[PDB]
Amino acid sequence: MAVSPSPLRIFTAGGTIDKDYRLEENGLVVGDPFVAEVLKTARLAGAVSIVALSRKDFTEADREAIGRAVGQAVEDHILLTHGTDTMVETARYLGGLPELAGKTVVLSGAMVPGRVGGSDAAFNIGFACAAALMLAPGVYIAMHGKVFDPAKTRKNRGLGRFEPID
Amino acid sequence: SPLRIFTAGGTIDKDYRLEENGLVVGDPFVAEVLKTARLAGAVSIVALSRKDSLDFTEADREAIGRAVGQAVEDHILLTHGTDTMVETARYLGGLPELAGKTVVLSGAMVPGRVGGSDAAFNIGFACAAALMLAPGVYIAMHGKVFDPAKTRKNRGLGRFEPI
Amino acid sequence: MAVSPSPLRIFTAGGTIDKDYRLEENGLVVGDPFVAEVLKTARLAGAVSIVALSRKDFTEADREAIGRAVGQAVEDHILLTHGTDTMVETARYLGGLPELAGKTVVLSGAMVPGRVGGSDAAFNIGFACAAALMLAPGVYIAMHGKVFDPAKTRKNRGLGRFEPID
Amino acid sequence: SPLRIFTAGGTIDKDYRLEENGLVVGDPFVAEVLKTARLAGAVSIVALSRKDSLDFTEADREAIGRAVGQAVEDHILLTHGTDTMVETARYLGGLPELAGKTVVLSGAMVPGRVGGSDAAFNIGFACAAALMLAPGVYIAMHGKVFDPAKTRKNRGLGRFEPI
Ligand SMILES: [Cl-]
Ligand SMILES: [Cl-]
């Protein structure tokens, strides 16, 4: 004999999930992709191709590059790790790209950096990988153990969570 | 829809005890993972057993089947030892009582309280599997969904594999 | 049976060692004292009284309060957890207080927050506790597995370490 | 002055192995702690043994004594199992060859690779003890310095205590 397929590709675009301390900045910067650290110890049957697109906390040019990389990917199952502050805008933009029509594209990340104690990151990565493999084609946000429709979602700062727009 | 989580012990929950000079099955690790998961939805955890999975009898499996049957929830995650996860999953897949439920078994090759554990990833993956898969019994391990009737644990590889 | 003594008192004055992520700030703040977390699992024979003096990354009034608390303590073995950026100035100020004459006073902390992966904090706390119990009376900085004389020490940003002044 | 660290295994270094379905003595945990300690001074680590301390013979202790004697350094940390740390420390305290050295034995009640371990604190404490104490053999555990000839492990308390 069997060959394990690798149907999921992951793109990383920085965000809180990848933040790490630097002595020079005397605080957090966007560091290496934390999803690579989670998948290293996941004992995967197959593998996951992880490609770093950008390392920002994020411009219109950056958004455009993400659409191109996702659209040019061979895989039909895609996970994009990203900051939560701009996740709805990125997700809605990807939603409007005809070339994504047959792909399941999930955005996720973490409210707490993976490299800070008490982070949601590893759970979110596991949930978002499953989501990207199991959901019908579309663009989704997977956070809080839930799937969100980008056109009907906002980040509620007071809650500290994404919430649906009724 | 509401997820119900049942804990049957196993490697995922193992923790060090001075008295034993080694690992024992401790408190359920899934509770530690979900505490920091910032969940939006309805979830509840129920402790069933703190055995090592090798020590399960026909009667431990019988009791697990009836316990899962007591849950009105249609989405079920059962955390369990990998050594007899296929036997429990096959047993549950044979119970007509459970046929409308999505039941996902998962756990970890390395205890969650040991460095470098698969446990958190596996819990996130299995929670999504329990919510997204059609009714049936499944093993969710290694970033994959296994059909219990067509799966074995391969000790040489340290993974479940298809038959 | 015997009664275990508690000869060490710890005062906390914030600093990098205690920094923790907050969703509201979208970055690090000075959080709860990390030394309390290290001592919780240290399986101490006796105990350590830990008193929080301040939570700053730090004014002249704050420096004065530290001198008062250290001087009024019953214990002759004192550990002050603190930011590294102002540690030499605090240490030199404590050095000039006659009321500290019979006390062993050690300042320490961490170049990386205790709640960030790959932190020096737990090692530094163990080393600094021993230092505060074992050194002769005086004021010291314990970092990098070494004891520094405050009057002959500077923080070298390029090295990322304290270094002696030759 | 230069510290030399010798590793003799024990609980501090235990790690989970799929093949054993449990803990084995693994790679020395002191190396993991010192990697992130941002040390200023001269330190070197030497592996002596990967036994569980219960399994030490008169000959394992003999070999440890001669190995510590091979170090020109006067400041020595030996990481070790707690179950026979008093026997090794008493043995070393009887060797005239070592009488100019400060030799500190330490370890952990909980493996460093298990959550909630004393190991990192104990390593920092013991490094300072090895640098600061007068020549002699000492156990540094529980934020305290023990005289080996006047110490026992109390299994009821889970700590070393004075006699
Ligand atoms: Cl920051
Ligand atoms: Cl074990």
Numbering used by the authors:
A (entry chain A), C (entry chain A): 1 to 57, 61 to 169
B (entry chain B), D (entry chain B): 6 to 168
The authors write:
L‐Asparaginases (ASNases) catalyze the hydrolysis of L‐Asn to L‐Asp and ammonia. In contrast, the chain of ASNase from Rhodospirillum rubrum, reported here and referred to as RrA, consists of only 172 amino acid residues. RrA is homologous to the N‐terminal domain of typical bacterial class 1 ASNases and exhibits millimolar affinity for L‐Asn.
Isomorphous crystals grew both in the absence and presence of L‐Asp. In the structure of the ligand‐free enzyme, residues 58–60 of protomer A were not traced due to the lack of interpretable electron density. The tetramer was created by 2‐fold crystal symmetry, with intermolecular contacts observed only between protomers A‐A' and B‐B′, yielding an interface area of around 625 Å2 for each pair. The ASFL loop is highly flexible in type II ASNases, and in the absence of a ligand in the active site it is typically disordered. However, the corresponding loop in RrA remains fully ordered regardless of the active site occupancy, and its temperature factors are comparable to those of the rest of the protein chain. Despite the overall low sequence identity between RrA and typical class 1 ASNases, here represented by EcAII, the environment of L‐Asp bound to the active site is very similar for both enzymes. As previously mentioned, Thr16 (presumed to be the primary nucleophile in RrA) remains well ordered even in the absence of a substrate.
